[PDB]
């Protein structure tokens, strides 16, 4: 079917923070978009930050910077940043979270795909975009009618 895409909600995966924190930060600072972070992604970053090979320690620092960035932004109750649990409940704070996940990332995107019978009283409005470089994940999104872009491409499009 034909989609009408008007990006509002941006959903990144774990490697977006590792690879592209600066660009996610620029997106969040722009105030144009709501960045929605799956809780599993925060959990994965926690795993990486906690922990070694050189590369592992390089990624560990990147995860630490990510978590630091998210922690600070949730502490200030940043209105353009949300986290979503596995049950589709939004969190306003991540501080005391306890505690291969494509399907959970996708469930987060689909949370913002609010389709109703009467909508087809004709294009499928999609206001969510999955931000990833992972080709398998991208294909999964494509087959679920979730718009998908890599973060550099999106940042270019956004002019922001």
From Swiss-Prot:
All residue ranges annotated as the PINc domain in the record: 8-139
Residues where Mn(2+) binds: 13, 102, 134
Consequence the record notes for mutating residue 134 to A: Impaired nonsense-mediated RNA decay
Tissue expr: Ubiquitous.
Outcome after substituting residue 13 to A: Impaired nonsense-mediated RNA decay
Subcellular localization: Nucleus, Nucleolus; Chromosome, Telomere; Cytoplasm, Cytosol
Subunit field text: May form homooligomers. Associated component of the telomerase holoenzyme complex. Interacts with TERT, independently of the telomerase RNA. Interacts with SMG1, SMG5, SMG7, UPF1, UPF2, UPF3B and the PP2A catalytic subunits. Also interacts with the exon junction complex (EJC) composed at least of CASC3, EIF4A3, MAGOH and RBM8A; required for the process of nonsense-mediated mRNA decay. Interacts with DHX34; the interaction is RNA-independent.
Protein function: Component of the telomerase ribonucleoprotein (RNP) complex that is essential for the replication of chromosome termini. May have a general role in telomere regulation. Promotes in vitro the ability of TERT to elongate telomeres. Overexpression induces telomere uncapping, chromosomal end-to-end fusions (telomeric DNA persists at the fusion points) and did not perturb TRF2 telomeric localization. Binds to the single-stranded 5'-(GTGTGG)(4)GTGT-3' telomeric DNA, but not to a telomerase RNA template component (TER).
Domain remark in the UniProt entry: The PINc domain confers endonuclease activity and is expected to bind the catalytic metal ion.
Official protein name in the record: Telomerase-binding protein EST1A
Residues of the whole record sequence present: 1239 to 1418 of 1419
């Amino acid at each position: 079917m034909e989609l009408e895409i008007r990006p509002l909600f941006l959903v990144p995966d774990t490697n977006g923070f590792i690879d592209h924190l600066a660009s996610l930060a620029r997106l969040l600072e722009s105030r144009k978009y709501i960045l929605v972070v799956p809780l599993i992604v925060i959990n994965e970053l926690d795993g990486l930050a906690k922990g070694a090979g050189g590369y592992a320690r390089v990624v560990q620092e990147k995860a630490r910077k990510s978590i630091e960035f998210l922690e600070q932004r949730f502490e200030s109750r940043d209105s353009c940043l949300r986290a979503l649990t596995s049950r589709g409940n939004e969190l306003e704070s991540i501080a005391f979270r306890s505690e291969n996940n494509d399907d959970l990332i996708l469930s987060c995107c689909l949370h913002y795909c609010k389709d109703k019978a009467k909508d087809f009283m004709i294009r499928l409005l999609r206001e969510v975009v999955l931000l990833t470089d992972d080709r398998n994940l991208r294909v999964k999104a494509l087959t679920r009618n979730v718009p998908v872009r890599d973060i550099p491409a999106f940042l270019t499009w956004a002019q922001v």
